[PDB]
Design a binder for these strands. Sequence first.
DNA 1: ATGAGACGCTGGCGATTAGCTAATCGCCAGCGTCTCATCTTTATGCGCC
Length: 64
Amino acid sequence: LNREDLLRKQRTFDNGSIPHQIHLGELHAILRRQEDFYPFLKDNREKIEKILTFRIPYYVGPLA
DNA sequence: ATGAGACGCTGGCGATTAGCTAATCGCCAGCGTCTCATCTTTATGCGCC
């Protein structure tokens, strides 16, 4: 209780510190471990990586 | 050369039967962050028609 880790759930409030890099790492690992079977995700793994990596610049604004 | 005209317990109960806002108060209110830039504006400090 004093160490604040008593029965903590998984989807909690402290996840705001989690960067996107580790999710991208786990994504690349899953893709590389599954690209040896299916051809389409082996072909479009960099597309999915682009989906996760894509961030609209602040100077662009609305994509109207 | 005769055969119509003249019409009731209700009111005062109960007792069904049916139906409706209003006055008082309490509760309780989606919120969390960051980045990035962007401009202002203020406090003080310096100049004479």
